[PDB]
């Protein structure tokens, strides 16, 4: 299972030994740990390594978390509410929840936790800094990013900012500079296969040989969490018996995107474009990020073999163009429909 | 403690009267004849930043009433609230009553009225002409499109042309008279060309080169001191870089660019402008060259405005110049 | 105090405290030091690349001008956390500017030269709106005898045109391995870092136009070296491995795939490369460096590849997907 | 130095409450004669001028003339956080800096020392009240307040007309009009209810209603309001204090006709 | 210290005959004034043609001495919300006044395009019910901003721009009344720079007269600064890129014009460029808008306008 078998220290990380050694090096002198920024592919194991370093530098009681609710108010009467995952040694925020009010949340909560200090008994007040974890920092707004970058050096003996994000590109240069940059490479096939082997020997699933885990690792593209989840779903559907002949369970949206690519490559007409717009509406309406839709659609289109070199080249060019346009707009369908129309005009 | 010598040169040399406002002769003369004849209609000053608008209107307010101008003259700059609820109460009450000290027409100076909402200007549109025989309005602005056409029509338009070379030279001479200092002729030409009409940049870089002398009483401000104070590229190495880009190959051109931009710590944004200004004089025997030469350079400048990289943009400038100087052959 | 400055990263541990420790911009610190003896301090506008010394030199100038006692009562600082809106810049900034300078104590008056004006510093003015900067104009203009403004920014274009004339401009030049190696040498000697002969040059070349990144890089390298306890020196490979710098061998492999290959092979290799964590900006920078510094290609290839790399960088700077942009760049550079 | 110890506490509060919401920034000049002040309205229409001698102060000590500029909002904030039973002392150092308001109770030791940072107001000290007025009058504050706040409900302008032994307040608006005509008469049993009038020329001139409603707020200080009117001159509304006086200089509204 | 009234106000017509605007509508208003049965009317047109002065002379001639109590004019300075239009306008509508037989009470709502829709909605019935005593008269600049019922109840009266003949006639009248030395070339230049604006023409006349005394082409072209949109229209129609660039440099940039104003004026000129086709107009507008977006981010140098002109020339030439 995903949540059950997870390392809870630095001596238990069983992949990317170089990154583990670097983390142990950063965990020797805690009082001199600068701000950290983890970047790498999705589902690489960034939050678990963060909470493992946090346990290595603090006591082992950092894993007991609790959710709290904080209510802020903007310039107007519109009251906003946020959830904070607090622990007696740190606090985790997801500022991406608020649409365009992140600048208020940051400049309020970070300042509040920076001014005062932490008191708790577990010799009444003397303690070290407090840690703030920021999930999905790549989605931060530019003004919120400026506020967060400025609330780093003013109060440095109290707050240590450990941010994590994939696709580090939407991070302004000052934040990229004033903090340490740690990369988290996806584990190799020989290591994710060992992870799966440990899971299958611990959960007692009936497998024939080691080729099933290899196929799972090859299908997951390197994503550890998705591989574990697909393995669990295969074990559930196959009734506690994994065999060499099992259909790889692709998520529903992957199958929808594949059917969309088939519809695109088969019929190049505006009548098909109407159904394409309908499918994109049904996909976006069910909480799917438009950039992920675009990436999957483009890669599945390049996967199509009946297209020559020039078609795939113009396709990747239009995809780069509409991906640039996607990060500068709000109505994502307005760009997705245009990209589909462009690929239809390109194919014929 | 506090005295006139502590103020920066931007404000220390503020023109007290209209006689100390050079350059805009054709507007100062008309304004002086206005105040002499006795008639002064609603004025609208429109000019680039740092030309003399606020100084001219303050000198006019001093000349009309007296040495105490901010007594019976109202002044609404961008620091005060100028909503519709303000033009309703405050401006109307000021324009509907008499003065407290003397018997004359009242003056209202709406400085930087381009930062007013459309509703505020529409409300002012009628109060500006309902009370004419008692008050006069003076609208100062830099962007003549923010004002509605109605308010723009009711006021006499006076444009403040950028300061020509002679006016800035006279002002430099007057400043060098009061402050013990010496300035070179070629340094004067470089300062004039760097001014771009801005009278404030002149005094700023002048104070800078005076401070960077270590003895501002004997040594003269050469062109190198001025070029160093603002970090602007000298025409010499600028033309050298342009020639090396146009003639030499790729490796040595990139090498000389990285050597010139690292000898004094220049910026690519200034090198682009300098190369454009130097190269606008060439006689290209085709129209397709200049089109690309401008388009690619403008794209690179807009990308620099966001600060993506530092060397990729330099090689992009080199490539744009080289590819544009290819349809000629 | 001293134990407090010991318990903080090297960025804040070696932040310059006076106008003499900032050894990067000799053109501006000269004016700022000459201002000390005089009293005509103009409205300042520091602008330049990130991590250069602006916020670290304005504080040093303030400390040297007023002193640790009057500093907390004679300056106002609006950097990013305060609500800098039109209403705030109309009310609070104006109230503090149109305010009487405090009485300097005999100790401060005797030791530090106290000028007859306060200081309002608006740090990172590129985040303010246009109306706020427009309102700042006359507020900074009329109270010029008791208040002087100091703006700081990374992009001068973001500031409106009128404020670009009132303030005196000061461009902070970038920090390469030529005029910033002395500070890094001094810090490495003060921290007893067993550096190699020319690793500092590589550290400064990695942090193009930035020093704070180089400082934290050296700190992390020294920490990783001390963890092992071997006491040996740090190599250039050791520091470039953790600086995000992509290894040279896999870069040569990338170039070999570009020199010849169909769409499918390049796509597969790009996917395999993106499987690992590599910042697309660094990969684009290294590809550009390798292709430009080379002399094996033709000018008709060099101009096109420069334009393509510039377009890819402009795309990546808007916070887009790294995988799609890198794949498009590699396909377009292979098309030539 | 400057030390001004009042006899009571609510005296300065009631004094400031006269022009609380009428002016924003004032500048007190303290000399050996007493505290003087004059401040212009935001719209530059009326001017408040206050003079308080050394009679209302329990103790007064001022060596050289000092000027102290300050806003009225923060001053009212400081006066509100003081209990009305203490003793108030204004304190200023050698050079003009943050003024020190000190509240000291008379029974228990309660030292409330508040500071107020001065504003840098341009010292354009004005000299009015030397102009010979055409008409002078004096009448109880209650009657003036009643008349003005009754006429303010019908219009925004009020025409005052002083004719031969006649005072006329005329309000003309949209829903209707109103005219209050009074005559000078003096009583022996009640010398405070008498209305006095000394004229040289009949004077007819208009004012706004908002400024009159803001001026009549000062009726809580005295009971006999004096009104001095003159053509081409600001109308003088004077309230006589026990030590000095508070005078509003209002600007008349001209007529297009 | 006496300040003489401006030539725009000192010579403001107080008689409906002195209006030199559209002859047909002015004659209609004249006949209505001589008769008295004035119906609700909306007057709209270009800024500075004489709408407000026309309706004011109409009211003064219709009510004469009763103008003090018969007319209730509400401008943009006065409040025009729902509260006032429901209370004060209604109370003035039912105000019993004994006027001459063929006369009526008039309500002058100037700048009608600035009122809220709810105000006009509430005003509909208040105007329709008391037609026997109240005759509203709206005077705005954009008739589209008025709601449909209010506009339909009243009789619309459009106003066109003043032709050069009317402007020259009024200018000659002013010169004859003011005893000023003038030449034909100066008056033609004033009319050309007036872009059909009576107030602007009179203001420029007074300016040049007080500035130089003699109204000649040199003086006006010296201190009137010939209109902006014409230079921009001339710039966008050059044959080669070099001529358009030289025009932009000498006439626009060197004379101290902000880049944002040049971009906005070029957009507005291309909006009404009837010479070139539709697709080329749309593409030019798209490129001008791209340049506008680039200007609004702060970067507004000469290079951006030069590249904009280069793109327009590349588009129009192929
Ligand atoms: N014509 C001029 N002659 C002499 N000095 C001038 C002139 N114009 C500007 N200056 C100098 O520039 C300073 C500021 O000029 P201002 O008139 O205040 O600028 P401005 O016209 O208000 O333009 P803005 O408001 O920044 S858009 C003055 O105090 C002078 O030192
Ligand atoms: N010129 C310099 N001289 C010495 N140390 C410097 C210099 N510039 C940067 N540093 C070091 O780098 C740290 C960061 O410098 P800062 O001035 O705070 O950065 P910055 O100029 O504010 O860049 P920003 O905030 O992104 S615009 C300092 O505390 C020093 O340790
Ligand atoms: N036809 C005209 N004949 C004579 N003078 C005119 C004429 N039209 C306008 N004027 C002059 O213009 C001024 C009055 O114009 P207005 O009525 O204010 O213009 P408008 O029609 O109201 O347009 P607005 O309100 O400014 S948008 C006076 O100075 C008149 O002398
Ligand atoms: N060293 C490891 N050993 C076993 N499982 C691991 C290891 N690293 C990561 N995982 C798996 O990764 C999953 C959590 O992924 P997560 O950290 O949420 O991804 P992301 O870093 O994108 O947030 C856990 O279920 C855990 O089983
Ligand atoms: Mg100005
Ligand atoms: Mg900074
Ligand atoms: Mg009108």
In words, what does this structure look like?
The PDB classes it as replication. Keywords: sliding clamp, DNA replication, AAA+, clamp loader, replication. This is part of a larger assembly, with chains A (348 residues), B (329 residues), C (336 residues), D (257 residues) and E (318 residues). Chain B has 329 residues and is α/β, with parallel strands linked by helices. Chain B folds into 3 domains: 1-163, no CATH class; 164-232, no CATH class; 233-329, no CATH class. Chain B contains 15 helices and 5 strands. Chain B has a 5-stranded parallel β-sheet with strand order 2-3-4-1-5. Chain D has 257 residues and is mostly beta strands. Chain D has 4 helices and 18 strands. In chain D, the strands form 3 sheets. Chain D has a 9-stranded antiparallel β-sheet. In chain D, strand 12 (166-172) and strand 13 (177-182) form a beta hairpin. The termini of chain D are far apart. With 318 residues, chain E is of the alpha/beta class. Chain E folds into 3 domains: 1-162, no CATH class; 163-226, no CATH class; 227-318, no CATH class. Chain E is 57% helix and 8% strand. Chain E has a 5-stranded parallel β-sheet with strand order 2-3-4-1-5. In chain E, helix 6 (117-129) links the parallel strand 3 and strand 4. Chain E is globular. At the B-C interface, helix 1, helix 9, helix 12, helix 14 and helix 15 of B face helix 3, helix 8, helix 9, strand 5 and helix 16 of C. The site of one phosphothiophosphoric acid-adenylate ester has 19 residues of chain C, from helix 4 and helix 12.
Largest beta sheet of chain A, briefly? Answer: 7 strands, mixed
Spatial ordering of strands, largest sheet of chain C: 2-3-4-1-5
Helix percent band of chain C: 55-70%
Structural class of chain C: alpha/beta
**Largest interface, C-beta within 8 A:** B-C, 64 and 68 residues
* Helix fraction of chain A by DSSP (H/I, runs of at least 4): 40-55%
| CATH architecture heading of the largest domain in chain A | 3-Layer(aba) Sandwich
* Shape, principal axes of CA atoms of chain A: globular
CATH class of the largest domain in chain A: Alpha Beta
Give the key terms.
part of a larger assembly; 5 chains; B: 329 residues; alpha/beta; five-stranded parallel β-sheet; 7% strand; D: mainly beta; five-stranded antiparallel β-sheet; elongated; binds phosphothiophosphoric acid-adenylate ester; binds magnesium ion; acetylation (chain B); DNA-binding (chain B); ATPase_AAA_core (chain B); cell cycle (chain B); Replication factor C subunit 3 (chain B)
Furnish the topology, listing elements before pairings.
This is part of a larger assembly, with chains A (348 residues), B (329 residues), C (336 residues), D (257 residues) and E (318 residues).
Chain A: H1 17-26, E1 36-39, H2 46-57, E2 66-73, E3 79-87, E4 90-93, H3 102-115, E5 130-135, H4 142-150, E6 159-165, H5 173-177, E7 180-183, H6 189-203, H7 211-219, H8 224-237, H9 252-266, H10 270-284, H11 290-303, H12 309-326, H13 333-347
Parallel strand pairs in A: 1-6, 1-7, 4-5, 5-6
Antiparallel strand pairs in A: 2-3, 3-4
Helix pairs in contact in A: 3-4, 6-7, 7-8, 9-10, 9-11, 10-13, 11-12, 12-13
Chain B: H1 9-12, H2 25-37, E1 43-46, H3 53-64, E2 73-76, H4 84-96, E3 106-110, H5 118-130, E4 135-141, H6 149-154, E5 156-159, H7 165-178, H8 185-195, H9 199-211, H10 223-229, H11 235-247, H12 250-260, H13 268-279, H14 288-304, H15 312-324
Parallel strand pairs in B: 1-4, 1-5, 2-3, 3-4
Chain D: E1 2-6, H1 10-16, E2 25-30, E3 34-40, E4 47-53, E5 57-62, E6 66-71, H2 72-80, E7 87-92, E8 99-104, E9 111-116, E10 135-140, H3 141-151, E11 157-163, E12 166-172, E13 177-182, E14 196-199, E15 203-208, H4 209-215, E16 224-229, E17 235-240, E18 245-250
Antiparallel strand pairs in D: 1-5, 1-7, 2-3, 2-6, 3-4, 4-18, 7-8, 8-9, 10-14, 10-16, 11-12, 11-15, 12-13, 16-17, 17-18
The complex binds phosphothiophosphoric acid-adenylate ester (AGS) (3 copies), adenosine-5'-diphosphate and magnesium ion (3 copies).
One phosphothiophosphoric acid-adenylate ester binds at residues 11, 14-16, 22-24, 50-56, 154, 183, 211-212, 215 of chain C.
GO cellular component, one term (chain D): nucleus
Cross-link (Glycyl lysine isopeptide (Lys-Gly) (interchain with G-Cter in ubiquitin)) (chain D): 164
Subcellular location (chain D): Nucleus
